[PDB]
Design a protein around this ligand. Structure first.
Ligand SMILES: Nc1cc(CNC(=O)[C@@H]2CCCN2C(=O)[C@H](N)Cc2ccccc2)cc(N)n1
Ligand SMILES: *[C@@H]1O[C@H](CO)[C@@H](O)[C@H](O)[C@H]1NC(C)=O
Ligand code: NA
Ligand code: NA
Lengths: 28, 11, 250
């Protein structure tokens, strides 16, 4: 639970996947 | 259409 | 998933496949919420109109997968079920109201680069993110079109839709335990869940703490990626008190 939602191959390495920015841009 | 899984799991 | 794309490796490490032992076949999607607990749609386990009523020993869960059909040696982990728990007021008779179920694993799964749990929303994350126009992400191995199955996990990003538009799109009765998502005809872009995507997660990445939260479960639709129709999702936060009661009781 403490580490939930943080992906080993993305958030944990500060790498972004190819479309997550589309989500962020919608959160206006 | 699925590759067979190890028999260990179906026991 | 219709009009999606192949997932990246490790993109959805909470994704779970519900697998029937005999015949060996995919049944549903699902999601990992801890080392012992899996979340899915109730209709993946119980739907009397189709003579579906599975018991623990009928089923396996496969965690860490990417390929739909391959046995992903040294990557995926296969777990047996200790117990199934269906919401006591799941409405399979009418409209899939409260379409939620939990599965406890016989033994904890080991986390890895490919296996990791998603968060469940708190009240404030839900209030802040469950707004019309805000996009979430749906994943699954279901059909690629209405009338055709994928080699690997599919992903599509979809906007939440205003509740009056959801209601006006269908004759089925909508409840507060549901929300709907998808593009409108004038918006151009497309995409939807489809048969076989049942029980998979609708997730959002919080811009406050950069963590992924599961806001929805793939529940129902009429056709797939039809103009003027939308996919409907179980409202996970609305049913979280039941989730917590089950996990604490058991
Ligand atoms: N097409 C599609 C399919 C799904 C997956 N869920 C189903 O297949 C459910 C299981 C039972 C039938 N069902 C329906 O969705 C029915 N087409 C409509 C319905 C709704 C409520 C009660 C009875 C029937 C998701 C999305 N987004 N789209
Ligand atoms: C489903 O099956 C279980 C055991 O097989 C039974 O106890 C239950 O009453 C069944 N429910 C329905 C709606 O058929
Ligand atoms: Na209506
Ligand atoms: Na549509």
């Amino acid at each position: 639970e403490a580490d939930c939602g943080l992906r080993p191959l993305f958030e944990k390495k500060s790498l972004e996947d190819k479309t997550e920015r589309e989500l962020l841009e919608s959160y206006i | 259409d699925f590759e067979e899984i190890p028999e260990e799991y179906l026991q | 998933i219709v009009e999606g794309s192949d997932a990246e490796i490790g993109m959805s490490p909470w994704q779970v496949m519900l697998f029937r032992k005999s015949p060996q076949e995919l049944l549903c999607g699902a999601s990992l919420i801890s080392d012992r607990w899996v979340l899915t749609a109730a209709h993946c386990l119980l739907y009397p109109p189709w003579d579906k009523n599975f018991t623990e020993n009928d089923l396996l869960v496969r965690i860490g997968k990417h390929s739909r059909t391959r046995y992903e040696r040294n990557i995926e982990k296969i777990s047996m079920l200790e117990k199934i728990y269906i919401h006591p007021r799941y409405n399979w008779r009418e409209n899939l109201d409260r379409d939620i179920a939990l599965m406890k694993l016989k033994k904890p799964v080991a986390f890895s680069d490919y296996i990791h749990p998603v968060c469940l929303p708190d009240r404030e994350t839900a209030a802040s993110l469950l707004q019309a126009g805000y996009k979430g992400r749906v994943t699954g191995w279901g059909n690629l079109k209405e009338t055709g199955q994928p080699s690997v996990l599919q992903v599509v990003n979809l906007p939440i839709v205003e509740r009056p538009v959801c209601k006006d799109s269908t004759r089925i009765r909508i409840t507060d335990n549901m929300f709907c998502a998808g593009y409108k005809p004038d918006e151009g872009k497309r995409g939807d869940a489809c048969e076989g995507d049942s029980g998979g997660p609708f997730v959002m990445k919080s811009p406050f703490n950069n963590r992924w939260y599961q806001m929805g479960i793939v529940s129902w639709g009429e056709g797939c990626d039809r103009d003027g129709k939308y996919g409907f999702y179980t409202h996970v936060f609305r049913l979280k008190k039941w989730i917590q009661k089950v996990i604490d009781q058991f």
